[PDB]
Amino acid sequence: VPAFELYKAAREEELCSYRSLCRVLCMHSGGKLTKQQRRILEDMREELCLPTERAEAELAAAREDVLVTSVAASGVLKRRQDLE
């Protein structure tokens, strides 16, 4: 594999991993993030070398995603004993 393909596969995973991080932390917090959750996002931004404009974009997107908000609304994640 040429280096540019490897970078591309890795870059896209970096950004996917951040995306799924925003959605999921918003599913739990209903978008209003704990200090730990903020620190996880902040640390991964630096780990993954993410421009904050893109990073704020993913967080903004996850906050308003319909699945994300429905899961926060349903409260199922607070009820794991019923569903597991």
Side-chain angles (χ1 to χ4, degrees):
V1 202
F4 73 92
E5 207 63 41
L6 272 187
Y7 187 73
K8 184 214 176 55
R11 197 44 173 168
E12 284 169 353
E13 289 213 16
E14 289 183 305
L15 297 113
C16 272
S17 98
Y18 196 76
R19 179 191 170 254
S20 76
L21 245 197
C22 287
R23 304 156 50 75
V24 152
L25 288 194
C26 292
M27 286 177 185
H28 274 94
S29 88
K32 158 77 207 138
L33 298 177
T34 69
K35 180 191 71 184
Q36 173 165 287
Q37 289 163 348
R38 291 196 303 287
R39 294 193 170 166
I40 287 166
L41 290 182
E42 175 186 10
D43 286 350
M44 291 299 297
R45 280 202 288 297
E46 146 200 334
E47 290 283 324
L48 305 184
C49 209
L50 254 48
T52 54
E53 280 106 51
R54 183 54 194 280
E56 305 168 314
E58 292 301 318
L59 178 61
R63 272 197 184 100
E64 82 176 16
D65 172 283
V66 185
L67 181 54
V68 177
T69 58
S70 317
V71 178
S74 77
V76 291
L77 284 175
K78 303 165 175 189
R79 276 207 289 129
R80 291 202 199 261
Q81 61 283 350
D82 297 352
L83 291 322
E84 278 279 351

